[PDB]
């Protein structure tokens, strides 16, 4: 009576819409708001910051509400998913819809972005908590989490490819300004965005049906569950731990730099590298390079140590981020740096998760009482990364507004391109250097104490 392979596959497939919608939004929402939705970059900055901060705000509140959810005849998590998915796909389709209003499009995008983030949180937090209810054996939970991670990577690739190849296929006319002084329509581009959103919503509904049908609950009846309302106390205990806090800050910064790149990289490809009709292929190349480089980094962390792996993975993108702003936008150099940046994205979003179980074991050795540190760490990390990535994206789009970013444009002023080169080349490098300096102060010192901590894990 174990978890079947079909049940684990359905549970993993249920985790694909979150990655698809998140990658589509995080790669193309700035392009949609600034160019397709014809918004002032002040309003686009407001919308991006408020949506990506309301996601972080909704994560623990909906987490607590799910922790207070009683047991129904369908489950503790399945009613949330089933009653949240139609409203979530409605709000997602209405994110990428441009209404015909006289004033207050910013309010439309704010309301529907924040409503979609709330409903996607109501989808995901029960779904993330569902790994403790599918089976009681820890090996089955780890296998389900491995399936979920693999299908999350594949969902990232599929969502990026779908949004890029539907959005980018139908181009739109540009807008010449005085910096340029001496058939496809804009409605076709909006229709392409609506088609991509509809396809993503169809995948969302199909995977929701798969997750509902193929996954049971077994009741569990809180066999070993506990209130654990010690959220503030757990946060304080984790931050009081040295290696834990250092891993939190390092990973957080590194992920902040790469989320800044994920936000303001399509604009850099369009308005600095000149890829007005080929930026989607660049994003697809980056995602394929990351998918290819996952086994390379899993090999490198073992054959050469996790510490040196997490150093060179974060420092590998720095020469190429320097290169992409110091060359006259050569077509081959951009693809080579795209492959390198995909390899570094894979390193940055893989290797700290490899480093995490060592710090978990170290915290177990230090504090014998451990009741959620693996989840308290992820909650703190996801909250701070979402909130500060929203802050960074809002500051980026507001700086584009300050620099005089032209809506569409075919050419940006010399100050907007400077801000884009800073937002791709200066601030991500600064954040990566900060994360690297934090990772330098690492008292775990990779395996040199780790097995000894594991020895204490054998002792206790």
């Amino acid at each position: 009576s174990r978890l079947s392979v079909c049940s684990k596959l359905c549970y993993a497939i249920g985790g694909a819409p979150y990655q698809i919608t998140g990658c589509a939004i995080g790669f193309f929402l700035q392009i949609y708001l600034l160019d397709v939705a014809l918004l002032d970059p002040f309003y686009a900055s407001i919308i991006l910051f408020v949506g990506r901060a309301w996601d972080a705000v909704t994560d623990p509140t909906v987490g607590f509400l799910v922790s207070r959810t009683p047991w129904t005849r369908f489950g503790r998590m399945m009613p949330w998913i089933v009653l949240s998915t139609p409203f979530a796909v409605l709000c997602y389709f209405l994110i990428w819809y441009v209404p015909s209003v006289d004033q207050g499009k910013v309010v439309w995008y704010l309301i529907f972005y924040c409503c979609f983030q709330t409903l996607q949180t109501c989808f995901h937090v029960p779904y993330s908590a569902l790994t403790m209810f599918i089976s009681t054996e820890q090996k089955e939970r780890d296998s389900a989490t491995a399936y979920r991670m693999t299908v999350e990577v594949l969902g990232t690739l599929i969502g990026t490819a779908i949004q890029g190849q539907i959005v980018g296929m139908a181009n739109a006319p540009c807008i010449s300004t005085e910096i340029d002084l001496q058939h496809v329509s804009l409605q076709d581009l909006r229709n392409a965005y609506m088609i991509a959103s509809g396809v993503i919503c169809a995948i969302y509904v199909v995977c929701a049906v798969v997750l509902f049908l193929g996954v049971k609950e077994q009741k569990d009846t809180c066999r070993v569950r506990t209130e654990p309302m010690s959220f503030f106390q757990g946060i304080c205990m984790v931050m009081g731990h040295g290696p834990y806090a250092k891993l939190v800050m390092g990973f957080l910064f590194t992920s902040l730099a790469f989320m800044l790149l994920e936000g303001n990289f399509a604009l850099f490809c369009i308005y600095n590298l000149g890829f007005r009709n080929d930026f989607q292929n660049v994003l697809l190349v980056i995602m394929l390079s990351a998918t290819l480089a996952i086994p390379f980094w899993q090999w490198f962390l073992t054959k050469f140590g996790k510490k040196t792996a997490v150093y060179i993975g974060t420092t590998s993108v720095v020469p190429f981020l320097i290169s992409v702003v110091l060359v006259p936008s050569s077509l081959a150099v951009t693809y080579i740096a795209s492959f390198a940046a995909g390899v570094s994205v894979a390193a940055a979003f893989l290797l700290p998760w490899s480093m995490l179980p060592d710090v978990v074991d170290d915290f177990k050795v230090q504090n014998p009482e451990s009741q959620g540190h693996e989840a308290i760490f992820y909650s703190f990390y996801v909250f701070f990364t979402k909130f500060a990535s929203g802050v960074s994206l809002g500051v980026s789009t507001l700086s584009l507004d300050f620099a005089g970013y032209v809506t569409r444009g075919c050419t940006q002023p010399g100050e907007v391109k400077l801000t884009l080169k800073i937002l791709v080349s200066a601030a991500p490098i600064v954040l990566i250097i900060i994360g690297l300096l934090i990772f330098i102060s690492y008292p775990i010192n990779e395996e040199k104490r780790q097995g000894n901590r594991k020895l204490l894990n054998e002792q206790r």
Binding site: D40, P41, I175, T177, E178, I179, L181, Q182, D401, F402, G404, Y405, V406, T407, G414
Partner: protein, 203 residues
Amino acid sequence: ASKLELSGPAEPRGSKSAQITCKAKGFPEARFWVFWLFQRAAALDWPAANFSGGPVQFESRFQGNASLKGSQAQANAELNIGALGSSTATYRCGWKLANGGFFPSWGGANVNGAAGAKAPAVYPVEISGAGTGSVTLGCLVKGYNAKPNLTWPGASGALTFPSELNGALWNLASAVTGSGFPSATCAVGFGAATDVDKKVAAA
């Protein structure tokens, strides 16, 4: 708030050069393109635009005629106009939204490229020996080079037609629909010390 204060009206003579100014305030002038317009009793033309911290971009019609300058230490945007003759118009100084390309705030200053300065001549044009109920009297003002203000003594039935060029001077007409005719006089409003008021007689 964003505002642009323009200079007063200028009267160049044929082929002089005229420099118009905008003392832009309420916004960083170096961040936005300050434009110019051109309305000679018609729709709006487009002379040029000037980025106050950089390039100047002209329309091909005004290349060599207009020259835009920007003093960022005074937040002043200026237009120097060269050879003239048909550039009598109203020039605007609309700034631009940094993203769209439209003009949110505007100015307005008149340029009159003519020659001469003469005192108006008043002629009391009247009836030709007819009358039926209400009758129309008139007043012709001919030969001036400024803006007058024709008035009547407390009678509000007047129609003062807009002035027109007759050579190098201006001609204007005024009409009044008066029922009874005890006494009527036409008073003009030529500010340059020419305040001649003349009565209207019969025949």
